[PDB]
Amino acid sequence: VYQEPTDPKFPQQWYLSGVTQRDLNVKAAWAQGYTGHGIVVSILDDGIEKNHPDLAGNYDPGASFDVNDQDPDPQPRYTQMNDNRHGTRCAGEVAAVANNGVCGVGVAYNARIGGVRMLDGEVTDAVEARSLGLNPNHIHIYSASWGPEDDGKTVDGPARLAEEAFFRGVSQGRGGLGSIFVWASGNGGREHDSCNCDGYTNSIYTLSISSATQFGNVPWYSEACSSTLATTYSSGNQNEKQIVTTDLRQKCTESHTGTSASAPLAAGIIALTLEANKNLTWRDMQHLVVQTSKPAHLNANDWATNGVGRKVSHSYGYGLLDAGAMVALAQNWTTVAPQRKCIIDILTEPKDIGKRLEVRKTVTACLGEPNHITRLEHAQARLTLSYNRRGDLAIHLVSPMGTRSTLLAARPHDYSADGFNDWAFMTTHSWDEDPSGEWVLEIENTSEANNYGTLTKFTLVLYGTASGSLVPR
Ligand SMILES: N=C(N)Nc1ccc(N[C@H]2C[C@@H](NC(=N)N)[C@H](Oc3ccc(NC(=N)N)cc3)C[C@@H]2Oc2ccc(NC(=N)N)cc2)cc1
Ligand SMILES: N=C(N)Nc1ccc(N[C@H]2C[C@@H](NC(=N)N)[C@H](Oc3ccc(NC(=N)N)cc3)C[C@@H]2Oc2ccc(NC(=N)N)cc2)cc1
Ligand SMILES: [Ca+2]
Ligand SMILES: [Ca+2]
Ligand SMILES: [Ca+2]
Ligand SMILES: [Cl-]
Ligand code: NA
Ligand code: NA
Ligand code: NA
Ligand code: NA
Numbered sequence: 001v002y003q004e005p006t007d008p009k010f011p012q013q014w015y016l017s018g019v020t021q022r023d024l025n026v027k028a029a030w031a032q033g034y035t036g037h038g039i040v041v042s043i044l045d046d047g048i049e050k051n052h053p054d055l056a057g058n059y060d061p062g063a064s065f066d067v068n069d070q071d072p073d074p075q076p077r078y079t080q081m082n083d084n085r086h087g088t089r090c091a092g093e094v095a096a097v098a099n100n101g102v103c104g105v106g107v108a109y110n111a112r113i114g115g116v117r118m119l120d121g122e123v124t125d126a127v128e129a130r131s132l133g134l135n136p137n138h139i140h141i142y143s144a145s146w147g148p149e150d151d152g153k154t155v156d157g158p159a160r161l162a163e164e165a166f167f168r169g170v171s172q173g174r175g176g177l178g179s180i181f182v183w184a185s186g187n188g189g190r191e192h193d194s195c196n197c198d199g200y201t202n203s204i205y206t207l208s209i210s211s212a213t214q215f216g217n218v219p220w221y222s223e224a225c226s227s228t229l230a231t232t233y234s235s236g237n238q239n240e241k242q243i244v245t246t247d248l249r250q251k252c253t254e255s256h257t258g259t260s261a262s263a264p265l266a267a268g269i270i271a272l273t274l275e276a277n278k279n280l281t282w283r284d285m286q287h288l289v290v291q292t293s294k295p296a297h298l299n300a301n302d303w304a305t306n307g308v309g310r311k312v313s314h315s316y317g318y319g320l321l322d323a324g325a326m327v328a329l330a331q332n333w334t335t336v337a338p339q340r341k342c343i344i345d346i347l348t349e350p351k352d353i354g355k356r357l358e359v360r361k362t363v364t365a366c367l368g369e370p371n372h373i374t375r376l377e378h379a380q381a382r383l384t385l386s387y388n389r390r391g392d393l394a395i396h397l398v399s400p401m402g403t404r405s406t407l408l409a410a411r412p413h414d415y416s417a418d419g420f421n422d423w424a425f426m427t428t429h430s431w432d433e434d435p436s437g438e439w440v441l442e443i444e445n446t447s448e449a450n451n452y453g454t455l456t457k458f459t460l461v462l463y464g465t466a467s468g469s470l471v472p473r
Pocket of ligand 9: 400
């Protein structure tokens with residue numbers, strides 16, 4: 001009985017529906033009756049063309065603001081180079097109108113869509129905070145495709161107001177269920193960037209998304225890191241198809257690209273999922289993504305099976321989002337227990353790094369205490385170290401269940417002598433593992449240079465619960 005959209009470019013949206021099995025299985029969710037009705041998504045970007053013929057029908061002024069000019073109207077600034085086209089492209093990915101003879105369709109083509117104009121101007125900590133904290137009892141899902149420079153030498157994350165906005169969002173947002181922050185993992189592939197050096201995507205509060213090409217490969221622009229949760233399709237080489245969406249000046253484009261296109265698609269899938277269960281918390285949503293995402297047909301040289309039997313890659317996280325499976329699992333989902341936080345100060349003395357440093361530590365993960373964790377979610381190694389050339393370092397963390405997470409890969413362009421100042425390297429790869437036992441931190445000099453430095457602090461921070469495990473996969 002379900003009739004798929006008749007829009008003129010819907011057949012070119014290969015990532016939504018295909019015979020191939022090389023899609024996000026979104027039609028299966030639509031057929032179950034989930035199209036995004038009642039869900040509100042906001043694009044945090046350079047503005048949104050609210051009068052676009054494929055966005056006007058779903059546009060929501062309540063999900064919108066202009067932080068750059070301080071007014072409610074997020075209309076893009078028009079220029080000859082069409083610089084401010086990105087928010088409009090992203091909005092169409094989430095929620096372009098269906099069955100209206102214009103362009104293609106959104107993943108959640110019945111959701112409401114807004115945008116925050118905040119990239120077109122000086123982007124301070126305050127600007128970020130006011131955008132992340134926009135109408136958090138009206139907006140359900142935020143999508144952001146921006147972050148620290150992808151030059152492969154930057155280490156940067158949210159400053160105080162922005163970090164406060166994240167904690168207020170997940171704590172009190174959406175009636176206490178928590179704002180859903182969907183984030184693009186980065187486009188610094190060409191610069192050999194490592195996305196744990198981006199504090200926005202590396203955050204536990206953001207649901208971070210990477211890209212795969214049409215033929216199932218790691219795109220040129222992709223950044224690998226342990227903080228990434230999952231993947232959606234985006235662009236690749238010039239024989240591979242691209243993203244079809246709404247463009248500036250009321251146009252339709254078939255050439256939207258990069259990881260910045262992957263986050264909105266994920267945000268759309270998350271909107272469908274929220275429609276299927278409005279009671280899902282921000283942590284519930286990340287559990288659903290971990291359990292339902294699909295590695296199959298994604299090519300990577302680093303696929304590994306973790307302690308509970310799930311395949312995970314630093315390029316793809318747990319794999320391709322599966323909309324049909326997300327909405328199915330959401331319906332009878334039992335809310336996870338309150339989040340526990342176990343803090344373990346590892347070092348008894350500073351340690352010289354030299355050519356290689358290995359730190360072994362057996363932990364009880366707060367045994368006997370209210371923060372006792374037997375089911376891991378995120379894990380962080382918060383490190384403070386000095387080093388003469390930061391990009392020569394590679395850092396790995398091994399869980400008691402034997403799962404080796406790359407916290408930091410060599411970054412050839414990172415010549416900084418500034419080291420890391422309590423930087424919270426995060427991994428999702430040990431999700432649902434029991435964290436009791438021996439953890440191993442490995443720091444190594446990947447270059448032939450006589451480098452030098454000292455690790456002065458290593459805090460292992462474990463998040464999770466002590467109840468509700470599934471039989472391993
Ligand atoms: N890439 C896009 N899609 N848009 C876009 C276009 C241009 C930019 N350029 C950035 C450059 C950027 N430069 C630096 N941060 N160093 C600039 O930041 C400022 C600006 C002013 C001040 N001082 C002050 N007294 N106000 C301090 C820092 C914002 C400055 O941002 C703008 C943006 C637009 C405008 N003009 C306008 N809105 N009519 C002015 C500055 C950034 C983004
Ligand atoms: N330092 C210099 N000499 N120049 C310089 C270098 C970088 C910036 N930051 C700007 C750069 C700016 N890029 C350009 N003007 N080319 C970037 O523009 C974007 C990015 C993404 C999208 N949307 C999308 N879907 N792709 C749209 C416009 C915003 C991007 O804005 C920010 C601002 C803050 C942050 N946060 C942070 N760094 N902690 C992230 C991005 C500004 C000035
Ligand atoms: Ca405005
Ligand atoms: Ca349409
Ligand atoms: Ca990056
Ligand atoms: Cl915390
Ligand atoms: Na809460
Ligand atoms: Na994240
Ligand atoms: Na153990
Ligand atoms: Na061991």
